[PDB]
């Protein structure tokens, strides 16, 4: 996940080493050579600025494009379930083709301005 | 100027992502975090 | 009136509330989210304690 | 889980959105139509108020009844393992009959008065 | 101090333990008790 | 995981009951009679004190010595990946031979002086 009301989405700041960072994340690990794994994260922002944003995570054996589409849909469903008006959805995803043993990771890290 | 800001609720969110190979699952995970730019902090998973 | 329990380690919670809920969902995570909402704790960040 | 000493069991208060809530929980998700799933939480309260309470969680493919009976037993066992005198056990459980994909969730949310 | 200052953890302690249990959770609980951290709330770090 | 820079490895301090303690841990549970299970934790300490330490966790169906060897190696690898000079690695391990159902647990608890 939940983005606090009035919180701003910003590029990752210079975090002090060892910080206890509240993080919503999705990840997947695979040891299957040639296998393509992906992870995605989405943040649904409400029109009503008094409300919170919803953070959804996804991971699976699919393409980057498929992962982001899925996680974005998940965020939308979250707002539909609450019945809140959506402003927009922000997201990113990553895919990895396993060589020997690989990991795909996506997250929303909460911190302080 | 707010004081004791770190004792209050986080007020920013940052999306990151990365991937990496590893000799073990945990090392691969670590490499992914490092690749995402968040490898040297303690992640507290929120759900 | 806000507090980050992970940073204010010297301030321990002094209340406990039992909640429960269930829900269907189009994905496991959405079902989970629905269950939390049904439980009345769906709009907060749960820091799982073990 | 652990209820801090002297903590009070209260109805869930209004929580600020996005709040970081330390929570002990059990949950189960099933995608088998017609299957019954449950989750339960118990809190064993000590007679010695200087001691802490023990929070147990359970989840499985059984009735709400069995789920609660089991989690209460787990709390009882926890106190026996510590050798502490039990005052009582507070618990709650929920059951869900899956239609297509469902989730049963039970929790003990720690907060501030 | 008259003014609480934010700080990162500044101590690390290694502990370990094992235990039998009537259920997985009771065994896990017994293991923490044996390790000396059975009565605190662990916030697992990733 | 991550041992903050300037943090110090000390014996477990007297923690207030119910305290929310950030902890990196590994654990394993088994119901296979006679099976040996173990868990270990390692902390790679940097020579450059402005850097952080890396905490690794491991658990498996093996002896205590095997678990500790593995987790110490994981930490070494973690420093090689970062290209950091290694001062030393502190580790701990535990093993358990299952009677009916048992658990092996190893952790690095982070706290404050
Ligand atoms: N870099 C991190 N914060 N985590 C990855 C490794 C975690 C080992 N317990
Ligand atoms: N409502 C919550 N706090 N959690 C469930 C939905 C968030 C999934 N990252
Ligand atoms: N003793 C603990 N902190 N944890 C194990 C028992 C509680 C499981 N909810």
C3 reaches E (C-beta below 8 A): no
Reply yes or no on domain C1-50 having CATH 3.40.50.10300.
Answer: no
Instruction: Please say whether the beta carbons of A98 and A32 come within 8 A.
Output: yes
User: How far, in Å, CA of E40 to CA of A72, rounded?
Assistant: 37
Ligand nearest to the CA of A21: 1
Residues 6+ apart with CB under 8 A from A83: none
Angstroms from F66 CA to nearest CA on chain A: 21
Q: Are the Cβ atoms of E46 and A25 closer than 8 angstroms? A: yes
The SS3 call for residue D78 is helix
Q: C3: burial class by Cβ within 10 Å (0-12, 13-18, 19+)?
A: middle
Q: Which residue of D has its CA nearest to E38?
A: D2
CATH of the structural domain E1-46, one choice from 3.30.60.30, 3.40.50.880, 3.90.79.10, 3.40.190.10:
3.30.60.30
Contact D47, D86 (CB under 8 A): yes
A50, exposed or middle or buried, with CB in 10 Å at 0-12, 13-18, 19+? Answer: exposed
**Chain position carrying tokens 């100027």:** B1
Task: Answer yes or no: are the C-beta atoms of C31 and C24 closer than 8 Å.
Answer: yes
Structure resolution, Å? 2.0
Q: What is the DSSP string of A24-73?
A: EEEEEEE-STT-EEEEEEEEEEESSTTSPBEEEEEEESS-HHHHHHHHHH
What are the chain F neighbours of E28 within 8 Å (beta carbons)?
Answer: 27, 29, 103, 105
The helix or strand, by DSSP H or E, that contains position C38, with its residue range, turns out to be helix C28-39
Instruction: Quote the distance between the C-alpha of residue F113 and its chain's center.
Output: 20
Half-sphere exposure at residue A71, Cβ-oriented, CA atoms within 13 angstroms? 34
- Within an 8 Å CB–CB cutoff, is residue D2 touching chain F? yes
Helix, strand, or coil (residue F108): strand
CA–CA dist D111, F5 (Å, integer): 31
Q: Output the CA A87–ligand 2 centroid distance in Å.
A: 18
Across the interface, whether the CB atoms of C6 and A22 are under 8 A apart is answered yes
The shortest C-alpha distance from A77 to chain D (Å) reads 15
Q: How many residues does chain F have?
A: 113
Q: Which residues fall within 8 angstroms of residue F39, CB to CB, at 6 or more apart?
A: E16, F25, F26, F27, F28, F57, F58, F59, F67, F93, F94, F104, F105, F106
**Paired tokens of D77:** 């066992």
Alpha-carbon span F94 to E18, nearest angstrom: 7
A25 close contact with E: CB closer than 8 A: yes
Q: Which of D15, D18, D20 to mutate to test the interface with A (most CBs of A within 10 A)?
A: D18
Among A74, C42, C25, smallest CA distance to D96 is for: C25
Q: F31 — contact with chain C (CB < 8 Å)?
A: no
**D25 interaction partners in chain E (CB closer than 8 Å):** none
Considering only CB atoms, which chain E residues are within 8 Å of A18?
8-9
Residue C2: CB partners within 8 Å, gap ≥ 6? Answer: B8, B9, D16, D19
CB-CB contact of F110 with C6 (8 Å): no
User: Can you tell me whether residue F57 is helix, strand or coil?
Assistant: strand
CB-CB contact of D19 with B8 (8 Å): no
Whether F17 sits inside 8 A of D5 (CB atoms) is: yes
- List chain A residues with CB under 8 Å of F52: 17-18
Mutate to test the interface with E, among A20, A27, A108 (most CBs of E within 10 A): A20
Nearest residue of A to residue F49 by CA position? A17
| Way the structure was solved | X-ray
| Number of the ligand closest to the Cα of A56 | 2
Of C15, C16, C35, the CB nearest to D105: C35
The hierarchical CATH code for the domain D2-113 is: 3.50.20.10
Nearest to A69 by CA among A49, A89, A54: A89
The CATH number assigned to the domain with range B1-47 reads: 3.30.60.30
């Amino acid at each position: 996940x939940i983005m606090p009301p009035e919180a701003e989405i910003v590029p990752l700041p210079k975090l002090p080493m060892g910080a206890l960072v509240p993080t919503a994340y999705g990840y997947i690990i695979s040891d299957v050579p040639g296998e393509t794994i992906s992870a995605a994260i989405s943040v649904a922002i409400p029109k009503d600025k008094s409300l919170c944003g919803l953070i959804m995570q996804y991971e699976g054996k699919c393409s980057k494009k498929e992962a982001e589409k899925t996680v974005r849909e998940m965020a939308k469903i979250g707002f539909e379930m609450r019945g809140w008006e959506l402003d927009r959805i922000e997201s990113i995803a990553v895919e990895h083709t396993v060589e020997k043993l690989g990991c795909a990771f996506a997250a929303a890290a909460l911190w302080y301005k | 100027n707010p004081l004791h800001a770190y004792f209050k609720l986080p007020n920013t969110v940052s999306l990151v992502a990365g991937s990496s190979e590893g000799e073990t699952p945990l090392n691969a995970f670590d490499g992914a975090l490092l690749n995402a730019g968040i490898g040297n902090v303690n992640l507290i998973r929120i759900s």
